[PDB]
Symmetry: C3
């Protein structure tokens, strides 16, 4: 029976290690560079803003990032803001009846300005505390619904991924060598029809993750594009191909709805004829697209092979002899 036992061990070393686990290969991780470009135009003709055009230079903030990009889907605008004194937005906290309620220097965390201790009139019927800030102050109580830039559902995104394995002298990109300019000009990614077109539609990205673009566009969120490289360098180089998957990354609270979506504030600065600073305040809601790249390569190397061989041999002998010892003890 010893011979039988030793054989099973031989099976383990040959089938599970060298074949199943490819113990004959050396492994390495990937170094990746990602660049993105978005195309699409949105047109709005609201009464307050008039006729507006939104192109790539308008809704992508900033122009370029690393492994990420942000696309604006909803917006609140405050134009003609100047440094001075103004009343606050009326609420349960800022409403005052006299100067006694207001305290000078009450610069809280949520106050967009520094209170001057004076109770001034926001309009004819309400009176609020006066602050020193950019005036008039922003009113963000009514987020637009549906999204202001809901046409972003039909925008397209090109992902250019350059991967490099420093150990094996192997580099390539996700734009395959058999892709032409004519094909790249009019291709949209699909898992079945165009699995290697590197151009994705944003609405399709959100839908493939199991969500709805129009629901997510009102307040924003985080979407994760996962690129996977599983290349065996013993094969041809044309068989090292990427795989794409999508997942929503921001966790949503439905019991309390604490801190939903994703937004930030930025401004565009101007000057008048007199030289005074002026600005437009922009509260931007939108979706951030993170590109996550995983990849490992394998190439045949003699060292790992030999190491495993020795281990298997040792293992076999030890086991067989262990079995022999146990058999005599049982006898």
């Amino acid at each position: 029976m010893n011979r039988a036992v030793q054989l099973l061990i031989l099976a383990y070393v040959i089938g599970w290690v060298f074949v199943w686990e490819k113990g004959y290969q050396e492994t390495d991780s990937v170094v990746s560079s990602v660049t993105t470009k978005v195309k699409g135009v949105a047109v709005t003709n609201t009464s307050k803003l008039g006729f507006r055009i939104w192109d790539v230079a308008d809704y992508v903030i900033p122009a370029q990032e690393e492994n990420s990009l942000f696309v604006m889907t909803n917006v609140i605008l405050t134009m003609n803001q100047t440094q001075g004194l103004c009343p606050e937005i009326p609420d349960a906290t800022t409403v005052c009846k006299s100067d006694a309620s207001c305290t000078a220097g009450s610069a809280g965390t949520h106050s967009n300005g520094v209170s001057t201790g004076r109770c001034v009139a926001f309009n004819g019927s309400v009176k609020t505390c006066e602050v020193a800030a950019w005036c008039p102050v922003e009113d963000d109580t009514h987020v637009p619904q549906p999204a202001f830039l809901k046409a972003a559902e039909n925008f397209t995104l090109l992902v250019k991924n350059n991967i490099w394995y420093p150990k094996f002298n192997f580099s390539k990109r996700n734009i395959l060598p058999n892709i032409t300019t004519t094909y790249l000009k009019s291709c949209i990614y699909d898992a079945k029809t165009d699995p290697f077109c590197p151009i994705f539609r944003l609405g399709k990205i959100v839908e493939n993750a199991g969500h709805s673009f129009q629901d997510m566009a009102v307040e924003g969120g985080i979407m994760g594009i996962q690129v996977n490289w599983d290349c065996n360098l013993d094969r041809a180089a044309s068989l090292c191909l990427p795989r794409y998957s999508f997942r929503r990354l921001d966790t949503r609270d439905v019991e309390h709805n604490v801190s939903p979506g994703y937004n930030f504030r930025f401004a565009k600065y101007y000057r008048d004829l007199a030289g005074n600073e002026q600005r437009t305040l922009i509260k931007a809601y939108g979706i951030r697209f993170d590109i996550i790249v995983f990849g490992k390569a394998g190439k045949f190397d003699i060292i790992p092979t030999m190491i495993n061989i020795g281990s298997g041999l040792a293992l076999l002998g030890m086991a067989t002899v262990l079995c022999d010892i146990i058999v005599l003890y049982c006898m």
Copy 2:
């Protein structure tokens, strides 16, 4: 005694491996997304700049980043810069007595413009070489002390961290489900009183790292916020909690004081009525806050358990039999 030896080995496999090392669990790394928001307003009434307001759109450059943010604490401003010809800032190098000293095209690395080979008068008493640049040139010899935006010590920062373990289908955020909006509106992190409030005060961040905010605010630096997730997925999901620690990341030289702090330059561009380009040059000193997230999860899996079991068995037999061989040789 063989029985005794085999027993000790049994102890090793049961106590150190399965229990202490949790060999019965499969492990995975974390995928994290970090978003930040800063609140706070600073007011200055200097003579040169007049009355100014600094809000989040003014001192955070750029509006949003990935795993990082920059807050301005000190500033030098050069307003009304136009492209043309101007003298350099007087020093030991730019001061000239005649056009012979100046050489045309002497565009060095530290020259903010290209020298035209002419010696012009900086003012009535000093004469410096003429350059072609944005004029007038910046004078950064006197860094303001104390910091211009020293009120940034009292600003607050919200950190939103979304973590995902791809292997186990587990995702959550650092804003716990038992945190409400009322609590989040007025909470400040403290290791003892509020260990899970995700809002930190910048001065407290710098102080908890063993430093002083006012000293660091004059020239800037790098501060590292470390988030640690140590979650055992066999337990309840509410026990996967983050831990926060802080450390200053920029190494300071005190023997020579070579390249201290952290600063960069950026500009705001304007136009006049005639269409000529005009700009304000801004040299910004401040602190960069890097968010570093570490996390590993563990969940029970049968494979690792069995593997360890086999190893322990093998080990035991081999050892016991090794001891038996050694005993006979000693005899």
Copy 3:
């Protein structure tokens, strides 16, 4: 012979493990922070743009990044763009003979505006479809050659790298303590003469990677600066030194030339006296410099040493006894 065999095993444990592999050391990975600064000025006197000055605030977009930076080398400018109606750039697709060819709402992915269904005259001889966009539309058919900002070859880049090993309480930077301000003011990196000056010239960076800066500057690309830390903490702290290498990261297609270089679009916004929005559209070509830091440290620890010792002992006995068993079977 048993004694001989056991001896060879002793050699393995002593020479390959403890000495060659340093099994007596505990290992750790690095946490790195990278900051960059670029110096250099370019002057152009083209007929369309007039006299222009390009300083660090003009060609670095954005002002600061994380582990990366972008330097502009070529540019196409479209000034005085306003929202309205204008014809498209003539080509094989936009040229129309009547309003029947144009379809209203034909907002494609490659259309910079939304077609209004009208065929208007681009100039006296050609007629193209009308779109609603920022007008006039950009004409990017003729990329300037040689590069507009080809003087960027002589710009210099300072890399400040702060590394930290959390396990061993060891931190330092790539600006060595024996580097002075006088040396840092006028040093350029060279592998033989100045191997530790942290200031690199961009043209030299591209040349050391095996390429030409002027060829790469017309359309741009990605360049990778690799920093390597190989520190043995048992030695003196002054011997933990960085090593620099360079590699081009963007893969180029020469058979089809699909998606070459690297570029993006951004705008500068202005207002007129009447309050209408106006902008300058900028298509920027340039090189992105990615800083990649690898580092592992080793310090003596008793645990790893003991573990290896035990393994070696076990190994020796098992092997020697395995050989003894095999010998009797052969007999």
